[PDB]
Amino acid sequence: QSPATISLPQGGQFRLSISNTDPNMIFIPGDKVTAITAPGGMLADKRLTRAGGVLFTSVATRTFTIFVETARGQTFSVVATPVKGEGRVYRLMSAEPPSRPETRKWETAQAYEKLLISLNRAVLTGDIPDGYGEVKPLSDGIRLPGGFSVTPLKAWAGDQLRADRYELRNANTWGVALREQDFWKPGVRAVMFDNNAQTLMGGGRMTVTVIRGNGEG
């Protein structure tokens, strides 16, 4: 079975049967019961379970009202009718959620990946990270699908990595879908396309930044 779930506004009153013979439990998920009150003599024993919750036994034969107070300031009321049977467990819920905790992105990318991403972003804006002094670009970097002519514009060189910018010419007249891995050359770390690719048309000049290792041949 599954605990019976009851949703109540603060001060809410729910009529639930309990058991005279066996221990009964009431837990509020995410909350710790701090107090319990019942008419006198009605509840024989009250103990706090692990992770909140109350375990309680009743020798009573009369319907009674129990008030339970949680640590987050919520108070609920229950009307309990004692009846023969198995100990009953109830899950207490709050009708209105008090607050919405903001989501937490815990995932962390790899160091190499973040390094390339940071540089690509810096180049896209144009601000230079320290240790990047600018350099002549090569012609080695770009393989051309066809109809493309490459001219180097700007390039940065640093202590570990190197970036450069080449502008491809407009292709002929057939639409040329642009594949970011179709401009690959051994030795290149990352290649990214400015704007959104998605087929340069019967023409268009698009600047492409190519990232390659530094020092290593």
């Binding site: 570990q160 990595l161 051994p186 290792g213």
Partner: peptide, 15 residues
């Protein structure tokens, strides 16, 4: 830096 080992293969339904 990292190895960057693969030289890429030479040469839905996306090749």
């Amino acid at each position: 830096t990292v190895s960057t080992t693969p030289p890429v293969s030479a040469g839905v339904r996306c090749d």
